[PDB]
Subunit: 117 residues, 3 copies
């Protein structure tokens, strides 16, 4: 899985341990091995939410499976909780786009995850 | 809705009020209320279009509904027009990826927009 | 087509000629003219892969068609090869998301490709 956070929160406000916490909590939430979890945090962005430049975040979570109605609501509670606690971003100024990726459409290690045919 | 612009145009060339203008124009175009519109502009990028590093942009528009053949043509004219007028980027050096998002696949405010089941 | 690379490799470690090589090799692999190919490289990123901040890359390739099982494996071999050679990123620390775009969902020059 891959999780990307774009935010107008300054780099200096991103706490020590943030990437690691995301990595571990996402491994637990998705049930995927932490060795396969990638995280990407992009601070100091020029963005607006509702026209306001108060702290906000635009996020993506990509996973092969483990994406769905109830699961995505669970991820949102987890991830919004972390963004609020660590970056002080209000949950109602966060968007997270969820993508259920087909194994054939994810490249890794010179190939993809479609090794069957 | 969420609109992202990545461009090699300098930060200084992004006019103040550009995010506000995008927010207002997108609310009008999509029929969505401005409170739910997010905008993100990323200048000074290392990019090429057709092998050339003249001004260009790679963009995305994510929306729950309001994405489609004729609507996307209308969005393209609107958005290219703004990028041309405001950032001086030629419309034939702009790509915009459109995404019709399912409500269940967009997280916000500790949950998603699938509140029904 | 368009290809984006986000990496924690420093900007100074991106070699002269990299964008051009990506453009031409992607033109070759996708069967589309190089004047159609867009490339975007984002160095100095704050990222981790498997909990480690050794060099890694998160990428995307969008194309109207030319996306599929065997084709994507070929793109991956090509792109991981370039990232390893040019940016010294290990292939098992690269992800590439492939998107088969509908022509109606790609805007360009005031319209779409539908
Ligand atoms: C005249 N013309 C085309 O007919 C097509 C055609 N066909 C072009 N593209 C190649 C296929 N495309 C893609 O695969 C994508 C580009 C960005 C996301 S998907 C869109 C641009 C194209 C691109 C740039 C300029 C003219 C172009």
């Amino acid at each position: 899985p891959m999780f990307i956070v774009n935010t107008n929160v300054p780099r200096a406000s991103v706490p020590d341990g943030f990437l690691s916490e995301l990595t571990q909590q996402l491994a637990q939430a998705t049930g995927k091995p932490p060795q396969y979890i990638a995280v990407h945090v992009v601070p100091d962005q020029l963005m607006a939410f509702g026209g306001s430049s108060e702290p906000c975040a635009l996020c993506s979570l990509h996973s092969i499976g483990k994406i769905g109605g109830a699961q995505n609501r669970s991820y949102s509670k987890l991830l919004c909780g972390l963004l609020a606690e660590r970056l002080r971003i209000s949950p109602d100024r966060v968007y997270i786009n969820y993508y259920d990726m087909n194994a054939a459409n994810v490249g890794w290690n010179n190939s993809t995850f479609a090794l069957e045919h």
